[PDB]
Design a protein around this ligand. Structure first.
Ligand SMILES: [Mg+2]
Ligand code: NA
Ligand code: NA
Length: 1216
RNA sequence: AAUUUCUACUAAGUGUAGAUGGAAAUUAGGUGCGCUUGGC
DNA sequence: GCCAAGCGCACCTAATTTCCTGGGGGACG
DNA sequence: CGTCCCCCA
């Protein structure tokens, strides 16, 4: 139904780079020659050593960083902090704050760069001279020296390290981490300190000062602005984060920090004071913790030795177990008034064992407390009652006996509980005798031996279970009637028992490590800039090039002693030829053109007039306040005339420049050079001579391979295969360029062939898709799971540049708004997140009619009339639970990110098809990053990865099956989001993607716009009366068997957003109360009113309901109102139950019930609650489009797209 | 159950469909368990 | 039984930066 | 004096 072709305007907008990856298959004697020359062994070792030198470099860099950071006093500080906290900042003061912030980052950067040695930190000098002089170990110095003549292999690393010293507000900069992140967090903590300082006791602060600040400072100092300098190094950050978080002493004492005190205060007084934010680490610091933690275990034998020695039936830990066993079996020989349960968790624990639940003791104590202290229920009553309870330090079992049933005995019940726990220990020790004798020997190493770890953990856990049970009986410690006959023997045994605590942690810590696995390593063929680029005039330096033979492509690498061997090969006018690439790139002309033409070589050849010289010297050609259009033109003509005399470029490129007088800046000349400064063609080379080179070992050749190049391949190729071929296709006019920087790696086999699951030839294999009617496949060859990991495999990574010279430049967001404004029937794809439905889709047209709606829990695909349906929701759930249980059982934690990615790529493909079909924009929830981060715990969270892979696709969106040269084909992909720089830099619109407020998109009656604005939580009897009276009427409706509640929202607070105001609610249908029960509203109302003798038929019922005096009537009434206003009804784990039901009637007296539409195949209204949300997310974008239609084009950028809550209820309640 | 790699497959027999930006560096987060002090 | 503040250990996940280069130049045999 | 690693912007 689309009226306007919008996607076609979004091609060739901006450039991006990608990487294509291939297997590289050695040809001929290549592998033998590489083996004989030891190249792979040298490179596997160089990789190890390279990482080692990077670690030594980091030692020097960190030392250089700390010296500078320790020595810096930021100047602005007090100024910046003042403005940063000012609450009434003009736009002019906000630019001011930005300036102060830039200057703070510049103080930090310039302090780094002002050292005279600074430039040397990223050139050959740091490996040749500086790091050797800085090191002392002879072996470390010789590792660094081995890279002499090889420093340009660190060039990328040098860039990583230089990022640390940028003054820019960029994530890998020290200045950013200091100023944008930590100063902000430091300033925030200053406001919190002033709010919360009054709760801290002077002895609490004094403990922190003594035990954390060494009495060298006051806690208050770290909340003064000027003190922020202390916190620039890791050393200061650790101190500051210890003030916040405390630390653990060598004895295991947890010294409390301020956040603990805040949390303790909050829980004591039922308040919610905010807490402090810890500071982030300083870049590159190797930080050691202020908390003590005992040393672990390092070998399977240490663990087995520890486990056998500390836990066998004769060990001192097992002794204490039997000793405590005897103490409890002899309970009645001890005075029950003499032994105590400390109040709090031990009382909760004992309560749940003796009575089933943690709170029964608490409730029974309140019972007798109420009997003394009752004559209605204030907050003051329960505060005093709770304070009185909190005062009781412990309970004797005698005291506890008085809470038991006549059949119950407390002392009895306890001793059978400990007997059960000792029983279990023996039952698990019995299963453990196999590794408790000396002769036993592991066959599988512990970190990969589930069977032995299961046996240890079961034993460990049962001792933990027993240990946690007996810790309840310690009492408070200062009870007077303390049966020291009972406790003397208890404390001795208990204290030995606690020795298990270190053993439990230490074994867990060892046994859950994953076994190390080796990485692929980069190959250099003894060139530090190996394969750096493809330019013909560099072949001899880079020693890698590309060949082609029919449809197959090859990587050709010259041995360093024979760098020229391919250039001495000519065409074979008789027998076969390879095609050898001829690649010319003039990269970054604004840098290379001056470099080449004002070089000593060129100025000597070419007499450049003093005018030309001064023009470049003084920079009168650059766009700026020193510009001179005529100077610019003279320089261009110098460059143009030099090009014609530079055969290296005049013969490689078909230059065709615009007339000089037409240029505005020199940039317009550079752009033409850049675009025409790329040419790729192929030259013939004798196949015989080339193959001789390979046999002789002078040349190494790899077929550049993926399965699309197999002689057996016959289906649609990978998109990346198409990209690769298009690089060399003469119909590609620079839309996709082959880039330099390619890399070659060796990935050693990680599986042995013998251990691969095999499917023998000629034996049937089961097919898995139940909808596939061919149940079985039988092949004449073997197939092996994961075969590719069972052999060493070279891989070749090739960068490409798409839209390197973009012509179609404009504001993408603006243009989208211009199109939607002028579009007659714009379509919107609404997409809703969830965890009942990972993703739900609703497509609407320009009038908001639903065109499609469905869940993406399952991906449905068709192959030749054969359906395949994949329940990815179910797969992700299973993986989630395997990961959860693996974490709990100390077994291997499987990956989930690849399954999510596999799912999301199916989702993105379908959304792309919907975008192209309907020419539609996309509507999403403006989830801030504070909601997306709290749903990370639900490891089926898919929405962040969905956004990421969606925006990636929409940066260059291609239909594989289209003509590569047509709009939307591989050479003309649509670019309908802004180039993806970062999530943080995005706004609420990203090209075709709109982010709208999600308020009341799900919990809303789509047929009427009705929403629940009432607060129905029971708070008091008086509060419920005023609620009831605030209705205009409450009556029973005999002719419908419903209760009707007339209300004007104007009589309840927090309702100004509603538009209709007057609504009649009905007790129509059922609700799901949350375990769960189904509740029929009408009958439940009747049940409630009958319980209290209310004549609910006596017309207007409100006065009657307010005459009640029982608090349980009003709480039950408010509960029933809550259910009536609960339009969304769900059973977790019952994906069949997610319905939406409205308590209000539409125009025709119908109640909306989503179940009436989920039946239908095509439904006009949402089929459930998740579809409702997607539907109204889309409608909110429809509203914003309406706003576009109200503005002039010149003002479309200014149109607010975030509909107000008030605007949305009006919109939703007048659409119908 | 094959893959540049990932997911789902066997798709008609060494493979099929879709996806796929690498590399390096930095940093943050999440799950789980234990321990300390607490709340329900 | 659940949860909070903090410390620790094991694991997996992911955000944000940089580069995607030929040719002059020199150190070095 | 040519080769090869370095360095640039
Ligand atoms: Mg294919
Ligand atoms: Na954690
Ligand atoms: Na915790």
């Amino acid at each position: 139904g689309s009226h306007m072709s919008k996607l076609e305007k979004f091609t060739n907008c901006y450039s991006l780079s990608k990487t294509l990856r291939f297997k590289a298959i050695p040809v001929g004697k290549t592998q033998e020659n590489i083996d004989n020359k030891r190249l792979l062994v040298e490179d596997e070792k160089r990789a190890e050593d390279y990482k080692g030198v990077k670690k030594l470099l980091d030692r020097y860099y960190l030392s250089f960083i700390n010296d500078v950071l320790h020595s810096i006093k930021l100047k602005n500080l007090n100024n910046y902090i003042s403005l940063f906290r000012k609450k009434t900042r003009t736009e002019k003061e906000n630019k001011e704050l930005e300036n102060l912030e830039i200057n703070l980052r510049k103080e930090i950067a310039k302090a780094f760069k002002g050292n005279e040695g600074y430039k040397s930190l990223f050139k050959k000098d740091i490996i040749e001279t500086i790091l050797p002089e800085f090191l002392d170990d002879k072996d470390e110095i010789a590792l660094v020296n081995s890279f002499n003549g090889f420093t340009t292999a660190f060039t990328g690393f040098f860039d990583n390290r230089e990022n640390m010293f940028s003054e820019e507000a960029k994530s890998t900069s020290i200045a950013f981490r200091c100023i944008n992140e930590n100063l902000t967090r430091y300033i925030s903590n200053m406001d919190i300190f002033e709010k919360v300082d009054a709760i801290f006791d002077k002895h609490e602060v004094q403990e922190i000062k003594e035990k954390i600040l060494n009495s060298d400072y006051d806690v208050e100092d770290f909340f003064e602005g000027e003190f922020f300098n202390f916190v620039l190094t890791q050393e200061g950050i650790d101190v500051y984060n210890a003030i916040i978080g405390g630390f653990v002493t060598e004895s295991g004492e947890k010294i409390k920090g301020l956040n603990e005190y805040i949390n303790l205060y909050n829980q004591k007084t039922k308040q919610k004071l905010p807490k402090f934010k810890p500071l982030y680490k300083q870049v590159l610091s190797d930080r050691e913790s202020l908390s003590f933690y005992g040393e672990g275990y390092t070998s399977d034998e240490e663990v087995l030795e520890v486990f056998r020695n500390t836990l066998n039936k004769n060990s001192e830990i097992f002794s204490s177990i039997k000793k405590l066993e005897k103490l409890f079996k002899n309970f009645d020989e001890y005075s029950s008034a003499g032994i105590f349960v400390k109040n709090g968790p031990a009382i909760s624990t004992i309560s749940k064992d003796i009575f089933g639940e943690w709170n029964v003791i608490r409730d029974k104590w309140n019972a007798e407390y109420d009997d003394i202290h009752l004559k209605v229920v204030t907050e003051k009553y329960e505060d005093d009652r709770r304070k009185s309870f909190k005062k009781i330090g412990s309970f004797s079992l005698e005291q506890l006996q008085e809470y038991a049933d006549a059949d119950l005995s407390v002392v009895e019940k306890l001793k059978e509980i400990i007997i059960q726990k000792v029983d279990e220990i023996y039952k698990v020790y019995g299963s453990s005798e196999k590794l408790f004798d000396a002769d036993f020997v592991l066959e599988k190493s512990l970190k990969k031996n589930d069977a032995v770890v299961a046996i240890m953990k079961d034993l460990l856990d049962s001792v933990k279970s027993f240990e946690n049970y007996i810790k309840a009986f310690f009492g408070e410690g200062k009870e007077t009637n303390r049966d020291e006959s009972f406790y003397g023997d208890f404390v001795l045994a208990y204290d030995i028992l606690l020795k298990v605590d270190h053993i439990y942690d230490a074994i867990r810590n060892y046994v859950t490590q994953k076994p190390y696995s080796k990485d692929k390593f980069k190959l250099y063929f003894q060139n530090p800039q190996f394969m750096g680029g493809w330019d013909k005039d560099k072949e001899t330096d880079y020693r890698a090039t590309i060949l082609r033979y029919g449809s197959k492509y090859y990587l050709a690498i010259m041995d360093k002693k024979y760098a020229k061997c391919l250039q001495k090969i000519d065409k074979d006018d008789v027998n076969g030829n390879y095609e050898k690439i001829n690649y010319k790139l003039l990269p970054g002309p604004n840098k290379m053109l001056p470099k080449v033409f004002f070089s000593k070589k060129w100025m000597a050849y070419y007499n450049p007039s003093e005018d030309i010289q001064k023009i470049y010297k003084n920079g009168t050609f650059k766009k700026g306040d020193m510009f001179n259009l005529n100077d610019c033109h003279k320089l261009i003509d110098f460059f143009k005339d030099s090009i014609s005399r530079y055969p290296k470029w005049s013969n490689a490129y078909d230059f065709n420049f615009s007339e000089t007088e037409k240029y505005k800046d020199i940039a317009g000349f550079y752009r033409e050079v850049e675009e025409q400064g790329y040419k790729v063609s192929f030259e013939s080379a004798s196949k015989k001579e080339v193959d001789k080179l390979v046999e002789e070992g002078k040349l190494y050749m790899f077929q550049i391979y993926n399965k699309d190049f197999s002689d057996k391949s016959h289906g649609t190729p990978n998109l990346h295969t198409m990209y690769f071929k298009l690089l060399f296709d003469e119909n590609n006019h620079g839309q996709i360029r082959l880039s330099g920087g390619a890399e070659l790696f060796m990935r050693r086999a990680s599986l042995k062939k013998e251990e691969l699951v095999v499917h023998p030839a000629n034996s049937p294999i089961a097919n898995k898709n139940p909808d596939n009617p061919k149940k079985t496949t039988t092949l004449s060859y073997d197939v092996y799971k994961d075969k590719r990991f069972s052999e060493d495999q070279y891989e070749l990574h090739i960068p490409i540049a798409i839209n390197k010279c973009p012509k179609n430049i404009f504001k993408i967001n603006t243009e989208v708004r211009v199109l939607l404004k002028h579009d007659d029937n714009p379509y919107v794809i609404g997409i809703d997140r969830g965890e009942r439905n990972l993703l739900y889709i609703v497509v609407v047209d320009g009038k908001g009619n639903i065109v499609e709606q469905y869940s993406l829990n399952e991906i449905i695909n068709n192959f030749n009339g054969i359906r395949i349906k994949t329940d990815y929701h179910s797969l992700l759930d299973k993986k989630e639970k395997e990961r959860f249980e693996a974490r709990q059982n100390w077994t291997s934690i499987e990956n989930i990110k690849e399954l999510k990615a596999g799912y999301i790529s199916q989702v993105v493909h379908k959304i792309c098809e919907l975008v192209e079909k309907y020419d539609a924009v996309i509507a999403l929830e403006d989830l801030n990053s504070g909601f997306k981060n709290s749903r990370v715990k639900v490891e089926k969270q898919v929405y962040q990865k969905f956004e990421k892979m969606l925006i990636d696709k929409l940066n260059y969106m291609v239909d594989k099956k289209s003509n590569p040269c047509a709009t939307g084909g591989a050479l003309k992909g649509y670019q309908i989001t802004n180039k993806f720089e970062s999530f943080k830099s995005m706004s609420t619109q990203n090209g075709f993607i709109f982010y709208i407020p999600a308020w009341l998109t799900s919990k809303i009656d789509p047929s009427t716009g009705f929403v629940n604005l009432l607060k129905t939580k029971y708070t008091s009897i008086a509060d419920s009366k005023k609620f009831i009276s605030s209705f205009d009427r409450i009556m029973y409706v005999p002719e419908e068997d419903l209760f009707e509640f007339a209300l004007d929202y104007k009589n309840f607070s927090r309702t100004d957003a509603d538009y209709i105001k007057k609504w009649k609610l009905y007790s129509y249908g059922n609700r799901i109360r949350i375990d769960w029960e189904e509740v029929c509203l009408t009958s439940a109302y009747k049940e409630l009113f009958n319980k209290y003798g209310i004549n609910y038929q006596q017309g207007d019922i409100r006065a009657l309901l307010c005459e009640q005096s029982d608090k349980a009537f009003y709480s039950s009434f408010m509960a029933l109102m809550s259910l009536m206003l609960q339009m969304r009804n769900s059973i977790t784990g019952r994906t069949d139950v997610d319905f939406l039901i409205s308590p209000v009637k539409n125009s025709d007296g119908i109640f909306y019930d989503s179940r009436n539409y989920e039946a239908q195949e095509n439904a006009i209204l949402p089929k459930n609650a998740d579809a409702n949300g997607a539907y109204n997310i889309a409608r909110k974008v429809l509203w914003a489009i309406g706003q576009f239609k109200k503005a002039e084009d010149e003002k479309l950028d200014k149109v607010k797209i975030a509909i107000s809550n008030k605007e949305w209820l009006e919109y939703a309640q007048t659409s119908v």
